[PDB]
């Protein structure tokens, strides 16, 4: 499968047709204040320079491997680990952002994918309820260099080729994330790829981060993906909720 | 394991020692109105007469196994299919629910437990999010008598002896539930029982159901549990929130 250009998604995998896909269209004013959604707490994201973390092309992002003993919680005793992060984006002049807000799709997006604690796999967890939980946040165009992701964007050339991968230093994970942890929107939802397991709980937070124009341009323009070929536009048509309601930690 | 004496129930099953355990003192002052709660939705719960249904005397409680087909929704891609239900009663005077409502214990309590349609059977859900499902009700005294109830209360009889069953016609099992499917509490907790796996989804329905006076006590009054003794009081000893907080569907 490739991002814009047939097989469509449901030939090469069914579950893509199902009801309770993602990315969504957030519409705020619809979302529903829900205020047990406490703030999410991250621990053990500062990570020292040493070891050092896996970056690939895998033709369909950029991901960053990351090691065990990033432990995430949605709620009391509702616990993650995290297992990589990686991002989608438009091209030049144009934006990618899987999720958008009442239609207006961000410049770029960055997915941290984790595993709840009660499966020991991943391939337990696809497809049951809350068995991966993805935070998601935008990236925008600010006046600043951002030198948390200045840190994987100046690796970027590296490894321009799909299949190829780096070494990179430990940074801190949670550096690349929004200031108010308590402030997001959450649904449960699917894989944006194939094979579009459903069970997914998505945190959407609520603030953007910022990045300057070098580095969204850097972001989009650096990479090759499949055929000879720019790895761009790498996210997918919003989905219909189909009676989903979106949740909001905020009112 | 029993109701008043030893085995103690972490030395039985470790989970009994869980931070965030069943049944728990809902506090509706505290509770998180969340309009993200819509109206539950039962199908196939209106059984005819054939095949026939085990009920049995099982020494902690009356359990009636429920057949395939019975399928709930806690809303949109949030589906359970029913297993069985079972009551929790007191004796004479003494009321014997699991939940209490600021401290109200009321006279009897109707479970009815669900698998996540993502589980092919029970072992495989135990302690995972989302898992397992009890739907609960309180039952009250009333000044007429429940012909719903009468179905199973009059069978009570023949599974005095412990450890005893017999078989029962089929019914309307949603006619065993309040008629309001909008207005309850829902939290995340535990199995009341060893293995008292976490993971566990509770709706709590606000509306109660009404029983006469005869009934309640045919229900406490008939059935024998280990020893020489009767079989009452088997509910659980109140659990804290230790930090959760229980939603509710209405304001
Ligand atoms: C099979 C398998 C697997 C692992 N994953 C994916 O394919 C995939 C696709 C999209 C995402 S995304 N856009 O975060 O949901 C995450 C994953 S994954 O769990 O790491
Ligand atoms: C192992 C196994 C099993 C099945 N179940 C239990 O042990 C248990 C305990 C308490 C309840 S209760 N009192 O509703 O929580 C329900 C079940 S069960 O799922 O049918
Ligand atoms: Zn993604
Ligand atoms: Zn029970």
Known sequence: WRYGGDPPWPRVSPACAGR??????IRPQLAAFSPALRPLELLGFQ???????????????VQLTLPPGLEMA?????????????????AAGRPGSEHTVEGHRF????????LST??????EALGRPGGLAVLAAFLEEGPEENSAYEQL???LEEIAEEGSETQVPGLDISALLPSDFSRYFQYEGSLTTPPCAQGVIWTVFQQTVMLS????????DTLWGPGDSRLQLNFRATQPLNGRVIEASFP
Chains 1, 2 share one sequence.
């Open 213 to 220: 124009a070098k580095q969204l341009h850097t972001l989009s």
């Open 74 to 90: 949605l709620g009391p005793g509702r616990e993650y680990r995290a297992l990589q992060l990686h991002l989608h984006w438009g």
């Open 107 to 114: 410049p770029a997006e960055i997915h941290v994918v984790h």
């Open 20 to 25: 309770f896909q993602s990315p969504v269209d």
């Open 47 to 61: 990570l020292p320079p040493l070891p050092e973390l896996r970056l690939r092309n895998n033709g369909h992002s």
């Open 118 to 123: 009660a499966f020991a796999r991943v391939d």
């Open 153 to 155: 964007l100046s690796r």
